[model samples]
Target chain A: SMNINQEQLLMFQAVMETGSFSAAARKLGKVPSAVSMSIANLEIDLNLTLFERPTPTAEARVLYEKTAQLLIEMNQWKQHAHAL
Target chain B: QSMNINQEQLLMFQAVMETGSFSAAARKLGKVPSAVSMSIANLEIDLNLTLFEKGPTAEARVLYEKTAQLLIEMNQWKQHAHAL
Candidate 1:
C-alpha cells in the first residue's frame, strides 16, 4: 500500500516531541537545519501540521493522538515509554 | 543535580494513574511515602495539575486525563531518546 515512510514519520515525531529543532536534531543526531527543514517537508507532504502551538517550547504540542490507535491497529505501537 | 531520577517519578505516576493511591504507586516504584509525594509534586511542577483526586466522594478516585496523556508521550520520547 502507498504510505508515509517510517523514517519521515519518526523524524516528524522527534521534532514534535523535543520542541527545538536543534534539540530534536541532537536527539536524532541529524544536522539542525536538516531536521528543521525535513519536518517542514513532511508537513508539506502530509498536508497536516503535526503541532498545534508551534512554539519554541512546544509546551502545547499535540502528538498524533491517533498514533496510539494506529500503533494498536497492527500491534506495532507499544505502551509508550515515559521520559526519565 | 539529579538526572533520569525522573524515571522513578514517572513510574510513580504510571502506578498511581493505573492503581490510584499514593501508597500503592510508591510501592511499585520502591519509594517511601514522602518520596512518592515529592516525586508527584515535582511532576506537577513540570506539568501543572493534580495527578490524583478524591473521586465521587471517595468512590474510585480520579487521575487527570491530561497528565495521563502527557505520560504517554513522555514515555515514548524518553525511550526513543535513550535508544538513540
Candidate 2:
C-alpha cells in the first residue's frame, strides 16, 4: 500500500491554496527546492500529478478534492496529540 | 478549518462497500442502517467526494481500495505506537 503523510497532504493543500510550489513551500516552512522535490516524489508515489490543471482526470480530481479536507482534519489531529 | 473523520468512519465505509449496502453493513457492525448511511454522507461532505452514487463504479472501487489500505496502515501505526 502507498503511504501518505501529513507533510505530503499539507504540501498538497498548500500548493492548491497558494497556487505554486514556491509559495506553498513558504507557507509550509520549507524551501522551494525541498518542497518541490517532495511534491514530485508524492506525485510519483501516487502516480498522479496533482498540480496539473483539471486534476489530470475525473477520479483523480475527486481524490485530491476529497483529501484536502481530510488532510486538514488529520493534521489537526496530529497537532493535538503532539504528533505534528 | 473544521471537519470530522477518523479510522472508524473509514472502516464503516469499507464495511458498506464490502457488503454492497448500508443496511447490510449496519447488520454486520451491529449498528443501524441510518447511522452507517449518515457516516458515509458526513464523510462525503467533509471530503467533497461521493462514496457511492448508485452502484459500484470504477471510481468507487479505487476509493475503497485506497481507503482500505489507508486504514490498514493506520492500524499498523497504532500497533507500532503500543510497542514504543
Candidate 3:
C-alpha cells in the first residue's frame, strides 16, 4: 500500500491507464524523464513496487483497481464534508 | 504518532522525506546539516525505524516492499485525509 498527494495520485493513475510513461508525461505536459522519475520517487517514498520499470503494467493496475472505489468514495466524502 | 518531536524536528523530518537526503532537506528547512542529522537520528531512535535506509539487498528490498504496501494503503486513507 502507498499513499500520495492528490497530484501524485492523479499522475500515477494516468500512468496506470496510459501504460506508457512517455505517453503519460505528454498528457501531463511534463518531460518523459520527469514522469519516469516522478513515478520512481513515488515508489521510493512509499517503498513499494507499483510499476514495472520500462513499462507500466498490471502491478500498478491491481493496486488502482482494488482501491479505486475506496478512493472515489473518499474523494466524494471529502467533497461532501467540505460542502457541509 | 509519538508526538515527541519538537516543531523543528517535525520540519526536519518532512524536509528529509521530501528531499530524500538529510543535507538537502536541511538546506531546504534552513537548518544545519548536523542538526538535521541529529534530529533524524533521535527520531529514528524513538520510532525504531530508520528514516532513510539506503543500499541494496535486505534493507532496501524489505524497506521498499513495506513502503509500497504502506503507500498503497496510505493513498486510500488520503482520499479522506487520514494520517496513515
Candidate 4:
C-alpha cells in the first residue's frame, strides 16, 4: 500500500534496531535531532504507522521487520545486477 | 515497488508526458533542457523503473498511462488533504 525509499527504510531500520532515535543517530554518527525528524517524516512519506513517537507499535514492528528483509534482498539483487 | 517521490519530480513527469519532449517540458517548467533530462534520469534511478524511450512507441504509451494515472490520484489526494 505504501512505497518507501531506500534512505527512509534505512532510517526506520536504525530506529527500530536501536532503543531510541538518538541511539540510532549516534550509531550512524549523525545528529540525534536530525534522525528524529527523518523518522517522523518517513512515516508520513510511507503513509504507514511506523512508530508511535519513540516507540514502535505492533503494526510498526511488522513493517519494520518486513522492510529490513526487503532491503537485504534488494541489495543482493543490486550486487548481482552490477556484477553482470 | 516504486520509491516515495517528491512533488518536483512529479511535476517534471507531468510536463514531459504532456509535451512529449524534455526540451519542451523544460521550457514549460522554466528549467533548462538539461535540467529536465537530469531530473528524469534521477527519477528513474530513484524508482528503479524507466519511464520513457526514444520516439513515440507502445512502451512509452503504456508507461505513460500508468504514470499519468498515478499522478492523477496523487493530485486528487493532494487537493483532498488541502481542503480538509
- Scored by DockQ, the top model is 4
Sort order, DockQ high to low? 4, 3, 2, 1
Comparing 1 and 3 on lDDT, the stronger one: 3
lDDT of 3 by residue, B1-84 (tens): 222323345456656766778778878977789998898777566445555665612232233333334344444543432211
Interface RMSD values, listed in order for every candidate: 14.4, 14.1, 14.2, 9.6
**What TM-score do all the candidates reach, one by one?**
0.34, 0.46, 0.41, 0.49
* Global lDDT of model 4: 0.63
Candidate 2 lDDT tens digits, B14-57: 88888888889999998899888888887676566665766453
Task: Give the Cα error of residue B83 in candidate 3, in Å.
Answer: 17
Residues B7-83, candidate 1, lDDT per residue (tens digit)?
Answer: 45655766776656788777876778898788777765544444455541112113333335545654564343333
What's the TM-score of candidate 2 when only chain A is evaluated? Answer: 0.72
Please give the DockQ score of every candidate, comma-separated: 0.02, 0.03, 0.03, 0.09
Residue B19, model 3: Cα distance from true site in angstroms: 30
TM-score of the second chain, cand. 1: 0.54
Name the regions of candidate 2 deviating beyond 4 angstroms.
A1-84, B1-3, B54-61
Candidates 1 and 2 compared by lDDT, better number: 2
Docking class of 4: incorrect
Per-model chain A TM: 0.57, 0.72, 0.63, 0.74
Give per-candidate clash totals.
3, 0, 14, 0
lDDT ranking, best first: 4, 2, 3, 1
Docking class of 3: incorrect
lDDT of 1 by residue, A2-83 (tens): 1233344455656666777788879977898887676676565445454555452222133344333333421221111222
Model 3 misplacement above 4 A: A1-3, A70-84, B1-84
